[PDB]
Design a protein around this ligand. Structure first.
Ligand SMILES: *[C@@H]1O[C@H](CO)[C@@H](O[C@@H]2O[C@H](CO)[C@@H](O[C@H]3O[C@H](CO)[C@@H](O)[C@H](O)[C@@H]3O)[C@H](O)[C@H]2NC(C)=O)[C@H](O)[C@H]1NC(C)=O
Lengths: 130, 175
């Protein structure tokens, strides 16, 4: 009713069109859920760096800099459950390294695999309505 | 030597502190600082008038502790830096505590809490600090004593400020 779930993995069919976009309101949460396993081989477990980027980096599906690193899916078999990035679409942050989100704007996530095949570009468009 | 009873930053975001009112005030936020994954409780209800938001730590077993020392690290945003910015913007928050024999779990009654002090930033985060990605991290310490009951909670009350709490460290000194 309030939070949106995205399964960030290369088997998620929603990424196939590369038009994957979800619509949120201010103060909605997006829960990006990292690949998670409890047995395939360690090397087969999907791992990603998530970036939060501007439109152009989204078009290229490539990060511009370290500053854009949002989170890391580098715990594919954590016992405590899947690793999870919970982004609240606030208008204002007290934290100077975080992002602010505005009504009528769109925001963009991309990933890169951690030392693995990039078969397909994984990206997400989040549009704030209002 | 210092014996640590609570260390938020060390817990890797697994702590799950109670907030009140339910799902309205403080939120657990996540970020990258110094190329490391970090967590913080933050609140920024500066446009909404009268705010009364509580973050309560989990119950801390006292043991042999008599005087505890509480180390807070946090940021606070310049009330001037809000496009709107109602005269309901504050630049402080309050630190409370309560002693208990048992863990009350999901029960939270504010009036059981005693105010320790108002917490104010030495360094205010200004709008230019955003494009410069400059984190001005305040450090504040308080102590309460003598503790007498089997355990205690700390709580943080926001009254309409834009705050991010990055660290909460409680310890006593042995000898
Ligand atoms: C990769 O993304 C997949 C989604 O495209 C994800 O599959 C999803 O797995 C979750 C939880 O494991 C399922 O959620 C449901 O789980 C059970 C099913 O009855 C119930 O508790 C709930 O109804 C709950 O919503 C999804 O149904 C499932 N979706 C699909 C299409 O299979 C994978 O788990 C992700 N893979 C990895 C490696 O993490």
């Amino acid at each position: 009713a309030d939070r949106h779930t995205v399964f960030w993995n290369s088997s998620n069919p929603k990424f196939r069109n590369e038009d994957y976009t979800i619509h949120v309101q201010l103060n909605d949460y997006v829960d990006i859920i990292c690949p998670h396993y409890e047995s395939v081989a360690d090397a087969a477990m999907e791992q990603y760096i998530l970036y939060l980027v501007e439109h152009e980096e989204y078009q290229l599906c490539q990060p511009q800099s370290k500053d854009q690193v949002r989170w890391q899916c580098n715990r594919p078999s954590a016992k405590h459950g899947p690793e999870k990035l919970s982004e609240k679409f606030q208008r204002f942050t007290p934290f100077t390294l975080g992002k602010e989100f505005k009504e009528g704007h769109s925001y963009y996530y991309i990933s890169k695999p951690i030392h693995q095949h990039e078969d397909r570009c994984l990206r997400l468009k989040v549009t704030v309505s209002g | 030597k210092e014996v640590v009873l609570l260390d938020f930053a060390a817990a890797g975001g697994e702590l799950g502190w109670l907030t009140h009112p339910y799902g309205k005030g403080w939120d657990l936020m996540q970020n990258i600082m110094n190329d490391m994954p970090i967590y913080m409780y933050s609140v920024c209800n500066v446009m909404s008038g009268d705010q009364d938001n509580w973050l309560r730590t989990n119950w801390v077993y006292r043991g042999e502790a008599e005087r505890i020392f509480i180390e807070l690290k946090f940021t606070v945003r310049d009330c001037n830096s809000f496009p709107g910015g109602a005269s309901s913007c504050k630049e402080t928050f309050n630190l409370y505590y309560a002693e208990s024999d048992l863990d009350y779990g999901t029960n939270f009654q504010k009036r059981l809490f005693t105010k320790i002090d108002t917490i104010a930033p030495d360094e205010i985060t200004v709008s230019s600090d955003f494009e410069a990605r400059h984190v001005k991290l305040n450090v504040e310490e308080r102590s309460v004593g003598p503790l007498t009951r089997k355990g205690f909670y700390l709580a943080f009350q926001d009254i309409g400020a834009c705050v991010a709490l990055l660290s909460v460290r409680v310890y006593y000194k042995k000898c």
